[PDB]
Amino acid sequence: EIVMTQSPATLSVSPGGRATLSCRASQSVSSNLAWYQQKPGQAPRLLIYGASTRATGIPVRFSGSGSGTEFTLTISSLQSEDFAVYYCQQYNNWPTSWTFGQGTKLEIKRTAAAPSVFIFPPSDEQLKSGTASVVCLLNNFYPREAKVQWKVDNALQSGNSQESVTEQDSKDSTYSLSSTLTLSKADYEKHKLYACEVTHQGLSSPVTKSFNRGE
Amino acid sequence: DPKIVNIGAVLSTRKHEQMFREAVNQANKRHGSWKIQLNATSVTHKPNAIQMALSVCEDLISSQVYAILVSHPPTPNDHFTPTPVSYTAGFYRIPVLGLTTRMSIYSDKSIHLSFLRTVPPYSHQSSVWFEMMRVYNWNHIILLVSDDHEGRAAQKRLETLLEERESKAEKVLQFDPGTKNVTALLMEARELEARVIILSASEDDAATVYRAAAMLNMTGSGYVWLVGEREISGNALRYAPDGIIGLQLINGKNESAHISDAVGVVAQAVHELLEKENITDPPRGCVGNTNIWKTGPLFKRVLMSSKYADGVTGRVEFNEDGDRKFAQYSIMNLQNRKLVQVGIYNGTHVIPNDRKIIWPGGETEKPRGYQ
Amino acid sequence: SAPSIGIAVILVGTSDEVAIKDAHEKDDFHHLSVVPRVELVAMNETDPKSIITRICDLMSDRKIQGVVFADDTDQEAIAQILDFISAQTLTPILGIHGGSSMIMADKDESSMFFQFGPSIEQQASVMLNIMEEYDWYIFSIVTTYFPGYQDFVNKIRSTIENSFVGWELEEVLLLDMSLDDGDSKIQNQLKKLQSPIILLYCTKEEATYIFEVANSVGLTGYGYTWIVPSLVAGDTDTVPSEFPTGLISVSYDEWDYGLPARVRDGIAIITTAASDMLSEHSFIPEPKSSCYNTHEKRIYQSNMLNRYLINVTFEGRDLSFSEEGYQMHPKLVIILLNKERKWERVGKWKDKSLQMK
Numbered sequence: 016e017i018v019m020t021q022s023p024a025t026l027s028v029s030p031g032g033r034a035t036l037s038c039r040a041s042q043s044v045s046s047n048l049a050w051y052q053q054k055p056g057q058a059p060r061l062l063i064y065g066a067s068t069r070a071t072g073i074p075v076r077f078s079g080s081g082s083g084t085e086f087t088l089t090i091s092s093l094q095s096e097d098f099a100v101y102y103c104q105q106y107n108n109w110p111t112s113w114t115f116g117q118g119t120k121l122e123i124k125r126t127a128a129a130p131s132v133f134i135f136p137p138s139d140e141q142l143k144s145g146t147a148s149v150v151c152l153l154n155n156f157y158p159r160e161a162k163v164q165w166k167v168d169n170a171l172q173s174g175n176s177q178e179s180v181t182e183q184d185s186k187d188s189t190y191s192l193s194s195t196l197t198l199s200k201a202d203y204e205k206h207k208l209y210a211c212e213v214t215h216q217g218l219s220s221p222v223t224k225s226f227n228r229g230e
Numbered sequence: 231d232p233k234i235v236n237i238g239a240v241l242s243t244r245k246h247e248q249m250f251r252e253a254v255n256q257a258n259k260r261h262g263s264w265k266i267q268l269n270a271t272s273v274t275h276k277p278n279a280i281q282m283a284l285s286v287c288e289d290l291i292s293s294q295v296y297a298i299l300v301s302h303p304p305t306p307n308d309h310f311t312p313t314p315v316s317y318t319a320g321f322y323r324i325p326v327l328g329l330t331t332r333m334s335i336y337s338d339k340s341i342h343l344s345f346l347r348t349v350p351p352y353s354h355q356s357s358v359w360f361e362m363m364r365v366y367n368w369n370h371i372i373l374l375v376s377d378d379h380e381g382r383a384a385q386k387r388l389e390t391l392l393e394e395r396e397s398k399a400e401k402v403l404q405f406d407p408g409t410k411n412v413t414a415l416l417m418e419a420r421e422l423e424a425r426v427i428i429l430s431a432s433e434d435d436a437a438t439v440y441r442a443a444a445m446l447n448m449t450g451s452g453y454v455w456l457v458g459e460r461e462i463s464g465n466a467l468r469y470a471p472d473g474i475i476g477l478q479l480i481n482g483k484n485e486s487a488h489i490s491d492a493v494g495v496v497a498q499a500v501h502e503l504l505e506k507e508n509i510t511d512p513p514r515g516c517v518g519n520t521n522i523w524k525t526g527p528l529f530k531r532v533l534m535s536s537k538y539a540d541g542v543t544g545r546v547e548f549n550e551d552g553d554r555k556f557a558q559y560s561i562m563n564l565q566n567r568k569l570v571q572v573g574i575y576n577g578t579h580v581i582p583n584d585r586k587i588i589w590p591g592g593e594t595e596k597p598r599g600y601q
Numbered sequence: 602s603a604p605s606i607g608i609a610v611i612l613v614g615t616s617d618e619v620a621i622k623d624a625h626e627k628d629d630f631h632h633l634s635v636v637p638r639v640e641l642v643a644m645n646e647t648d649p650k651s652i653i654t655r656i657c658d659l660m661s662d663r664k665i666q667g668v669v670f671a672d673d674t675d676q677e678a679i680a681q682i683l684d685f686i687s688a689q690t691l692t693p694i695l696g697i698h699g700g701s702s703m704i705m706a707d708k709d710e711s712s713m714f715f716q717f718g719p720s721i722e723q724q725a726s727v728m729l730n731i732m733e734e735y736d737w738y739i740f741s742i743v744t745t746y747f748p749g750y751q752d753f754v755n756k757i758r759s760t761i762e763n764s765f766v767g768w769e770l771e772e773v774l775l776l777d778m779s780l781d782d783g784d785s786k787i788q789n790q791l792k793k794l795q796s797p798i799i800l801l802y803c804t805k806e807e808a809t810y811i812f813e814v815a816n817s818v819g820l821t822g823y824g825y826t827w828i829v830p831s832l833v834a835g836d837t838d839t840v841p842s843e844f845p846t847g848l849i850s851v852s853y854d855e856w857d858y859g860l861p862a863r864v865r866d867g868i869a870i871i872t873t874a875a876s877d878m879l880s881e882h883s884f885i886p887e888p889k890s891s892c893y894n895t896h897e898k899r900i901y902q903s904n905m906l907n908r909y910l911i912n913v914t915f916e917g918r919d920l921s922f923s924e925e926g927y928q929m930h931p932k933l934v935i936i937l938l939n940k941e942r943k944w945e946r947v948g949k950w951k952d953k954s955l956q957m958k
Binding site for chain 2: 651657681682705707748894896
């Protein structure tokens with residue numbers, strides 16, 4: 016009955032800066048809210064309960080306010096370990112209503128880095144089973160927002176491209192993107208030119224890597 | 231994570247101690263235990279009145295309780311029972327709730343300085359006499375109260391209520407307590423223009439007065455009596471003239487209900503108080519500490535103004551002295567040696583029943599109470 | 602030749618023990634045959650755990666028949682413990698100084714606890730007596746929910762018509778300071794009052810707030826010649842800093858009545874009563890050496906002492922107590938507040954006679 020909404024969907028900030036997230040109140044929640052901090056792959060933790068009281072064992076940087084009107088928090092003096100997924104929790108008609116939130120995504124701002132574009136043809140062993148795969152690798156680029164296009168004999172390819180993005184590194188906070196194709200042996204041998212086009216903000220011009228089958 | 235805030239209870243009848251523990255365990259389930267998880271700590275009564283004080287000091291030291299619940303022992307004498315508890319754990323000014331005691335000395339909030347009650351005292355029934363007086367159209371009453379702190383409170387309350395209406399009572403007699411011969415006072419009330427007689431005395435003295443009046447021809451046909459609750463139960467029941475109108479508190483013995491209500495009220499007060507900074511923990515250690523609890527009167531002030539929503543005994547308010555405002559009563563008549571209920575006192579007015587009433591000496595027709 | 606009457610002198614005020622030891626039993630009562638014993642006990646704790654245990658252990662030590670209690674704190678909850686322990690154990694005890702000298706409303710009807718100090722009615726009587734002398738006839742009273750307020754106004758009303766002088770009373774208040782969020786009502790009520798002479802009734806814990814709000818509103822400039830009882834003053838050496846100049850009050854004599862004199866006269870009263878009863882009836886009560894197990898130790902009632910301890914005179918003084926247990930004939934002094942925040946004595950009142958300067 017109370018849909019939990021936040022703003023914005025995603026937020027990127029530079030190190031040593033503040034961040035403000037607002038969790039919209041769809042109805043008149045008296046004083047109950049709770050913001051959670053979760054690192055990827057780990058269970059969340061408690062930060063605030065009652066919309067004003069800090070959780071025990073938490074640093075004093077975090078704070079918030081709200082008595083039923085668009086509860087908001089203000090984090091200051093942030094460091095590198097911050098910028099995780101932050102949720103909001105309400106409990107008005109507990110223990111029966113229990114409407115959860117969504118959780119905004121946070122990123123750390125960084126300077127643009129030119130991606131390292133690499134391509135990989137099949138190793139002649141996968142083709143024995145009747146399937147061929149082409150791997151295009153992007154290494155140490157920022158931001159993660161990049162466009163990768165596959166050019167098979169100068170033709171647009173769709174519906175057969177899989178992309179995997181690694182999490183931000185703990186050393187340089189970089190991103191990595193890998194493009195994997197899945198095509199049959201007969202289709203693979205019907206074409207000779209396979210190109211991987213990479214478009215990025217840190218590159219003045221798009222980078223395309225192409226190779227010829229059996230060459 | 232949560233700070234345990236344990237509360238005590240000196241109630242007897244160990245089964246009732248288990249009941250109190252279950253009550254507090256239910257109490258902390260409804261609210262939650264991420265910030266507050268209130269515990270339980272019970273102890274049983276002791277025969278003498280000094281070891282009781284020593285034991286209550288010991289458990290106060292050992293648990294640093296926030297409030298204490300006190301009930302009645304299984305061997306009556308329920309006047310000096312919660313005397314040591316109030317003195318001992320009011321020296322440090324920590325609240326104490328009385329569950330069943332009805333004596334009127336505890337309403338003096340200067341010798342105890344912290345005593346909340348869940349049952350109205352014996353002097354709060356005088357308003358029922360006034361309301362029934364107004365309803366039945368009697369206006370020439372005689373008081374026959376005793377000489378103690380118990381009769382004086384009732385006479386004071388009735389006198390103020392009467393003077394507020396620009397009326398007066400024909401006389402105010404007073405017999406010394408523990409007397410075995412009272413005939414002069416009965417004769418003095420005998421020669422007069424007043425018929426309504428109102429009693430306020432212990433059961434033994436009530437029996438003596440009933441015997442003296444029965445010896446004379448004073449329980450006749452137009453001598454409508456009026457008594458309270460302590461003059462109907464006990465040895466005074468069988469020595470009673472037919473048609474003696476009396477009252478009785480509707481729920482004054484079901485200790486389970488009072489335990490549950492007190493636990494609920496204390497839990498609400500505790501969960502309400504901690505939403506406030508600058509508080510101090512109670513003085514753990516009864517042998518070293520010598521000072522007043524810093525946030526002592528504040529806890530009493532926040533406790534004495536809590537309107538419990540709905541309980542087994544109903545709404546739980548608190549008169550501005552600490553004794554159970556807005557209680558109910560039941561009116562009975564001694565018909566054929568077996569009391570039968572007639573009417574009820576809803577706390578504001580009197581609702582007559584359908585069962586008819588037999589006045590003294592038969593005479594189903596109402597007596598005017600005058601000559 | 603009737604020795605061994607047991608009196609214990611409990612000391613908590615940490616005063617000079619030798620100074621009061623030199624006056625505890627220096628005199629030899631050749632008129633009364635009690636030849637009493639005393640035993641000074643010095644403590645530093647005022648907890649109810651230590652008081653009860655100490656008194657019970659002393660009763661178990663050697664057959665003591667009485668106790669005189671002293672104190673230095675202003676605690677109002679030691680008199681109650683003393684009264685209760687004197688009710689359960691029939692040994693009569695007297696409070697002479699400090700926290701055990703604040704008048705309790707009504708003692709346990711089976712108890713023997715006699716204190717030093719004046720009641721509420723006597724304070725009102727002397728307060729009206731000073732008012733009559735300088736002819737400040739018109740007056741008004743404001744009170745709260747405190748002991749004797751009904752008795753205070755009843756004593757005022759009882760003597761207002763038995764005298765031919767024309768008192769003209771106006772206005773009465775019942776409001777108490779325990780109300781929550783009712784400050785607007787109290788402010789309106791105190792702003793309403795404009796009477797020439799006002800007699801207040803409140804205590805320092807609440808009197809601080811009462812004085813603060815009265816000064817904040819502004820009804821404290823010149824014409825507000827307040828008159829207050831002893832308990833408003835509290836401690837002379839300490840001032841709550843509101844205290845409008847011109848305050849007058851009556852307080853028990855605390856400067857010319859030293860601790861040794863109080864100890865001496867308490868021992869004297871107990872010994873005189875015991876010796877008189879011993880001479881008349883030729884027996885003396887003796888409780889068992891069990892403090893806790895007094896349930897069956899009350900076989901011998903000791904109400905004869907209670908009827909023989911309230912009428913005693915010696916050295917030309919009347920030390921007669923009353924049924925409620927107050928002094929019934931104290932010595933009261935009147936003090937005044939000058940420009941500098943300090944109190945100054947003016948006169949002395951004794952035997953219903955006022956002698957001022």
